Design a protein around this nucleic acid. Sequence first.
DNA 1: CCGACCACGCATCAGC
DNA 2: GCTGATGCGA
DNA 3: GTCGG
Length: 323
Amino acid sequence: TLNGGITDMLTELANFEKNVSQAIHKYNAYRKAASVIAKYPHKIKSGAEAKKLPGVGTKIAEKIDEFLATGKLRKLEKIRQDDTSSSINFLTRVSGIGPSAARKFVDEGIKTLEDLRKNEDKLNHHQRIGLKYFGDFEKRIPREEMLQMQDIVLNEVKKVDSEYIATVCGSFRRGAESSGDMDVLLTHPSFTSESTKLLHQVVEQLQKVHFITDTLSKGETKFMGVCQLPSKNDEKEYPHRRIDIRLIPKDQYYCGVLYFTGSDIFNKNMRAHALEKGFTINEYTIRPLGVTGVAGEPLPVDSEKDIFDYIQWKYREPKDRSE
DNA sequence: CCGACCACGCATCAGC
DNA sequence: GCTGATGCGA
DNA sequence: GTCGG
Ligand code: NA
Ligand code: NA
Ligand code: NA
């Protein structure tokens, strides 16, 4: 209610930049602006007021001035009514259909889910799955269902080999009340950066008990697919969900878990901090920095805490990593 | 003024 | 056939 | 689009 009109406006602008104009950096600029504004504890009264926040520049300030004075933004109103642009933007909501595919589909008259349905031969495997679960994929996942999903994942993984180590990351691990998907990081003592079907066997067991229902992509270290909780007789059917499974070398596992648990703000801050202490932390490792800025060999990591110890930072619970 | 910004593994395309 | 680029959603 | 070297 505070600045929702402003944040929706910026978010909508972001989407058109990404999906229609294919300007990913403007996309992020608008989102960044929208985020900082979403956190501002005051109802913005002018573009000048908003420009004081990091991420809001001259143009977004001008756009806010227009929105506040007229209650709308001419450019956005025009874009919304544009048949071509609104269709391109809409099609990208289908997983598998990015800005490029959406643009090509619209160029040849394919503009709706209905048109996609009757042009199956023009969709790749991923896109067909995205169309099939269009609705389910836009629904969020309540934490209670995420817990039920975790139960199955951890149970089957252990059933395949009790030596596997699996961790469900994402906002879920930080305690979020709802998730958009499930991200499982996996490792095994037999797989390290130096020596090594570890992923395949887990994916297969999950398909055998009918938890995983579809495959978007699958290689030796990353699986992206679809899964669904079993429903009891009578009870309605749970919606299909997106699930990713990543096999990560044991010696890089904890740097992986840290990264994939975030938040993104927390990662940026933790990385920034590390640099201060003379360390460079990435998704895979934490390495010391020489006085001339040269990175040394990766330091041994056997828990998230080790990472924190290295940079002399107190261990913070996942729940307390909002930033 | 003008370049950074920019998760990377897997599916599929463009080219040889 | 293979190699590298591109699209895509992480 | 915004920031900043
Ligand atoms: Na600003
Ligand atoms: Na899409
Ligand atoms: Na090539």
